[PDB]
Structure 1
């Protein structure tokens, strides 16, 4: 029908998940002009003509659309390959955020994943108090930007370095993590990289997961097929580690194993598979059956040792293989301070005391500035480097 058509087309233009919404189209055009405006390319009439036709237009667009200079960088609060994360204040709204920058070039400079789609998707649509929230995603010719909510409480790595974590606390966090992961699993993802670095605390001291660059959609059997291991040395599960071209087919248990590693570390202060060198940790992980030993410390409760072991074991017998409910029913969690379904409503073990909306006391210092890093080389022929990053923008068609 002539009506049905105008409508479907209207929906494809609106839907916050359509590959051709205003966000995708404005991006598509923005990408083109960006990937054409080079003297070597302008030699071609069409290109030159087109660009002059859209010169005034494209410029007005880039001034109306969300851009980097719309934010006042309060301070850098995290770095990594592919880019950094900075405490920013939106110049116009005065609203404070944690904006994540991603070097378009760096990711293109061998990253073999396009990981950022998962992260954009999850943080933008999860709508879970366990997931860091993405408010805006925009880009330019050099960086991807992810305007997320700021977690003033800092990460769990920082917390652990400042306190000798008592069981009560360890229980609380392990519990919030378990609920957080369960929520991510519910969205149909295996996290694959559960670690204290990605565990952040809000202004109330409650946990949220950030950084989902390793998340991968589970199949109908609830499994994942991967020939190359992903994650972190200390926390990678024996199966994700051994994952080979021979198959590489594991379930969500790999996350629970990591939770065990997480628990062991809070109580002990060391990782269950620490070694002189990374490669040592590798051997100790595969040999978990023998390498998993607790130091002679009379303070790790029976239950704690039990759960840690229930997690740090071969997938087939690992606690969690039979849904999250069997983890929750473990004795280690048995307490008289909270119940699972109301946990994030109980008072946290460490509540941050913040001086201002931009208080970064719970984040280690970092240099700032650096000096504009090298990006793509000026094209001699049409390369189209902005094409892989079309539709990343989350601004014109976001969900409400």
Structure 2
């Protein structure tokens, strides 16, 4: 089949689940809490063991009251509805979801290799072949998501998890949205924001392709193309219309980056008549066998070190806090459909 045809069928699969979402498919007491793997403003991700199977999972736990205070109700409903409907090699679909008086719970495949962020900062930068290996998986994932009319909106190393085989999972769908037109919400991470977001224009999925340019730059340079100590200074840089590349960047890398980090939407790669093929058929991707990446048959350039199925040495240590469940239901109406 063509990719077109593969995607069309994946859309039929997605849409059935999108229109009739799974709801209340487990309970907290079915899991043993192991370790906090990360924290957000309104929640955390923990490693848990599912007792009936002994499988390990990542459990994202969101405090309903905190979600409400941060005006993230609709975004949170988006995340759960989308994640329970998708299926792709580089995504972690929801295995289960449920809620209780206090919290929302989303249970996903656990990625034991840790955050790309951690390895990238420690090692310093990745070689071009290394960066390319990751980038290809992102390119396929976005092609999938965009075909389902989904915009992702928070690409960054912090949210690219490495699996046992050294492949990646694109996680944190907190800003993901199914939208056919343009959308307007100011969201994302300062370093990764497209100019049109910063300038409060309506925008579309082209913001994901700009974000990819930021990521590939960061992976290959070891620092992002636009940085400063404060967000406002970062936004001045992004809109300014200039980017400098490290002398070690290949000619093909720089050319790809100029076409991704392009302020002009009529010229930005991924956004043109030829769609994602402008990116896939670019010279920097010449050695990339897209079918082999999708199949996860390419040998990963780097594989994290493990000693166990729930080893967590690739994660930072976070203060372990209780998972408290109030005796009173909080925010029932807001999260009715979750």
Kindly provide the CA deviation profile for residues 33-74 of structure 1, in whole angstroms up to 9, marking residues without a partner as x: xxxxxxxxxxxxxxxxxxxxxxxxxxxxxxxx7322321111
Task: Give the aligned CA root-mean-square deviation in angstroms.
Answer: 2.2
* Cα shift at 1:215: 1.3
CA distance in 2, matches of 1:121, 1:374: 23
Correspondence 1:69 to 2:29: yes
Which residue of the other structure, out of 299, 305, 310, is the alignment partner of 1:347?
A: 299
Counterpart check, 1:385 vs 2:328: no
Consecutive unaligned residues in structure 1, runs of 5 or more: 1-14, 28-64, 393-400
CA contact (8 A) 1:126 1:187 kept: no
| In 1: Cα distance, 2:322 partner to 2:80 partner | 27
Q: CA deviation at 1:285?
A: 0.5
Secondary structure, in 3 states, of the residue corresponding to 1:346?
coil
How far off its partner does 1:207 sit?
1.4
| CA-to-aligned-CA distance 1:131-174 (integer Å, 9 cap, x gap) | 11210001100000111110011121112113231111011111
Counting matched residue pairs gives: 317
Deviation for aligned residue 1:112: 4.5
- Contact 1:204–1:348 at 8 Å: present in 2 too? yes
Equivalent residue of 2:84, what SS? helix
Question: For the residues of structure 1 that align with 2:73 and 2:101, how far apart are their CA atoms?
Answer: 20
Q: Aligned pair 1:366/2:324, yes or no?
A: no
Superposition map of 1:388-399 within 5 A = 388-392=334-338
Greater C-alpha radius of gyration: 1
Find 2:286's aligned residue among 319, 330, 334: 334
Rounded to whole Å, the distance in 1 between the matches of 2:120 and 2:74 is 32
**Which residue pairs with 2:171 in the alignment?**
210
Q: Is the 8 A contact 2:183 2:204 kept in 1?
A: no
Cα pair 2:192 2:214 within 8 Å, conserved = yes
* Residue among 121, 129, 136 paired with 1:168: 129
Once residues 160 and 212 of structure 1 are traced to their aligned partners in structure 2, the CA distance between those partners, rounded to angstroms, is 22
Is the Cα contact below 8 Å between 1:86 and 1:99 reproduced in 2? yes
CA deviation digits over 1:244-292, x for unaligned, max 9?
xxxx3222111110000101111111110111322110100011x23x1
**1:320 and 1:326 in contact (8 A); partners too:** yes
Q: Which residue of 2 aligns with 1:225?
A: 183
The Cα shift of 1:117 comes to: 2.0
1:249 aligns with one of 202, 217, 231: 202
The answer to whether 1:200 aligns with 2:161 is: yes
> In the alignment, does 2:237 pair up with 1:277?
no
Deviation larger for 355-364 or 108-117: 108-117
Inter-CA distance 92–224: structure 2 relative to 1 (3 Å threshold): same
Deviation at 1:17, TM superposition (A): 5.8
CA distance, structure 1, for counterparts of residue 213 and residue 326 of structure 2:
40
Matches for 1:281-296 after TM superposition, within 5 Å? 281-287=234-240, 289-290=241-242, 292-295=243-246
Query: Where does residue 44 of structure 1 map in the other structure?
Result: none
Structure 1 pair 179–17 and aligned structure 2 pair: CA distance change class (3 A): closer
* Alpha-carbon separation, structure 2, partners of 1:372 and 1:75: 12
Deviations 1:273-328 (A, max 9, x none): 111322110100011x23x1124x3x211111111111111122211112101111
Q: Map of 1:1-400 to 2, 5 A cutoff?
A: 66-163=26-123, 164-219=125-180, 223-226=181-184, 228-243=185-200, 248-287=201-240, 289-290=241-242, 292-295=243-246, 297=247, 299-314=248-263, 315-322=265-272, 323-335=275-287, 338-343=288-293, 344-368=296-320, 370-371=321-322, 385-392=331-338
